[PDB]
Structure 1
Amino acid sequence: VGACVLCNSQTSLRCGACIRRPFLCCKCCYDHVISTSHKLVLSVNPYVCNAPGCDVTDVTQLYLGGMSYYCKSHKPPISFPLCANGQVFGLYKNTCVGSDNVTDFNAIATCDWTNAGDYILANTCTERLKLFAAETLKATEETFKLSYGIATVREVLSDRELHLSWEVGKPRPPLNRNYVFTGYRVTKNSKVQIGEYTFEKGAVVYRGTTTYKLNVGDYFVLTSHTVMPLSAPTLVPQEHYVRITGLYPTLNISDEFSSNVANYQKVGMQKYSTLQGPPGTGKSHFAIGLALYYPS
């Protein structure tokens, strides 16, 4: 019950086939639910037929018959199509702005994250859509990785050496420092703390975080989160004001900060000065010298 992603209007409808379950206003929801592979809409109650044993869950076909929502094959005479005027039935039916060019959101919704072009559109759009694309991307990332081969090592080769078994029907993901797993210790009922470790060439050698001694029965996965919605943009709006706002002028500095003084002022005189850095130019020294310039 909040603003929709493309219109900033209070609605109550959510794409059922999306991953984020985003808010979409009535005409805006009509657009997205006819123009992509999102076929479901949920409101304060889910718009699904109530006749026992129905599993057709499109958007246009459903019919509202009072305290229920039907399909045309499920429909007593007193009704009205839930889809008319190009506008789905839901709260705040009037005061929704909608949007005609929503093919950008449509593509983001259908973006399955395979091509580079997916990332290109995901990085070319506007702000809250940036957020939606980002969180859909990370959610699809964890759908990707967790469902792959189980790290079920079923014996120990030697000191820091192991023998590997993995999931059947689903392949196994890389074993590199770019791919960090997480351990769970099986007992007669459930799992216990082990931690994150890495696998490499062995016959499996593990570059463990810390010392561990695991016998058989153990197996690993690379755990993840359940990423929730965000709040804020990628950056703050800029500034071109007259003051070093909120801080204190300087008395002391070391002359090795000579190249540091000239850029201290620009970062604090306006909202943000985005730093590019060649390798080993003194950036962290600069990032430490920030507090050196103003102890306060």
Structure 2
Amino acid sequence: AVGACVLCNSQTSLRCGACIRRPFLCCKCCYDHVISTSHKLVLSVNPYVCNAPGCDVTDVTQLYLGGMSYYCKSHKPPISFPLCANGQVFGLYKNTCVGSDNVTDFNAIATCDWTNAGDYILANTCTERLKLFAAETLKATEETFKLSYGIATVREVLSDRELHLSWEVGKPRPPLNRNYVFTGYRVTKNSKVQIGEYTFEKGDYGDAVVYRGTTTYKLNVGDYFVLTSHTVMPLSAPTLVPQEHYVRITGLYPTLNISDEFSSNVANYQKVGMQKYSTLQGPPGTGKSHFAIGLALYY
């Protein structure tokens, strides 16, 4: 669709195919990103692959817009013209795309695997749009890390309260606690379909897991489990709504002798009313999570 470039908010119709989140990029910013990094796939309204009978070229400097579609170097219609050239990448709204350098921090944000620690300290001290894009791609990478996990199966059941576990040979084994769930398969002939939502926890003796389920299906030995995925939605809203300082309390109303216990935090309640958003920082067990209930009793 027609969208807005991430780092300059110009109009655009291009996206980076190699990026996990597929972000919109204007012409200048897309050229700066693709000519310097290893990303070489750009999706317009139609993807920029070469439209031969069969050809697989994706690098954008190799391609041309020939005839009525995108064609590679030796498949092009004899009439050209180059796509990735003149300091830009050909897309919609071509002559209105103006960005800024932050194409030195965006390269690092797009390329980094979020393994080191400096990636986070650059993903949180950058500009405001990059603060959203970096969070989006970090969530996407955290989700796609689960794709490298090992799927289970059941050995047998001597005790129906403690499942037996069997991991697939040649893959890592996920930790057993409450945070991770699983969903099954019965792929014998005969129902490659889920069999419920289960969860696991280890047993003290031998090899066993004292499982839990959302339903009460049993596993004939072929039935097994895989940890479930989660597509990450666009980081649609800003991280912090911009602050405005009202002259007086708007939308909120005080109370008549709130209590004899919350009488100290009254000034902070009024300050909360004045500002759009407020931050309360205090050492633990000083009255923070009780301040909120006092606020409720005040409004």
3-state SS of 1:113 partner: coil
* Percent pairwise identity: 100
Deviations 1:105-129 (A, max 9, x none): 1111111121112222111222222
Deviations 1:134-172 (A, max 9, x none): 221122222111431113223224253221111233221
Deviation, 1:242, is 2.0
Specify the alignment match of 1:116 in structure 2: 117
C-alpha separation in 2, matches of 1:215 and 1:243:
67
More strand by share: 1
C-alpha separation in 2, matches of 1:167 and 1:161:
19
Deviations 1:174-203 (A, max 9, x none): 1123434345677964466765544232x2
Deviations 1:78-115 (A, max 9, x none): 11211221111111111111223311111111111211
C-alpha separation in 2, matches of 1:231 and 1:260:
35
C-alpha separation in 2, matches of 1:210 and 1:82:
55
Once structures 1 and 2 are overlaid, which stretch shifts more, 73-82 or 31-40?
73-82
Once structures 1 and 2 are overlaid, which stretch shifts more, 37-46 or 166-175?
166-175
Deviation, 1:67, is 0.8
Cα RMSD (Å): 2.5
Deviation, 1:293, is 1.1
| Aligned length, in residue pairs | 293
Structure 2 residue ranges without an equivalent (≥5)? 203-207
CA contact (8 A) 1:62 1:69 kept: yes
CA contact (8 A) 1:26 1:98 kept: no
Deviations 1:12-54 (A, max 9, x none): 1111111111111111110001121211111122222112222
C-alpha separation in 1, matches of 2:108 and 2:196:
38
C-alpha separation in 2, matches of 1:91 and 1:62:
17
Deviation, 1:4, is 1.1
User: TM-score normalised to the size of structure 1?
Assistant: 0.88
Structure 1 residue ranges without an equivalent (≥5)? none
Specify the alignment match of 1:172 in structure 2: 173
C-alpha separation in 1, matches of 2:85 and 2:213:
60
Deviation, 1:56, is 2.5
Deviation, 1:263, is 2.2
User: TM-score normalised to the size of structure 2?
Assistant: 0.87
CA contact (8 A) 2:197 2:215 kept: no
C-alpha separation in 2, matches of 1:186 and 1:261:
63
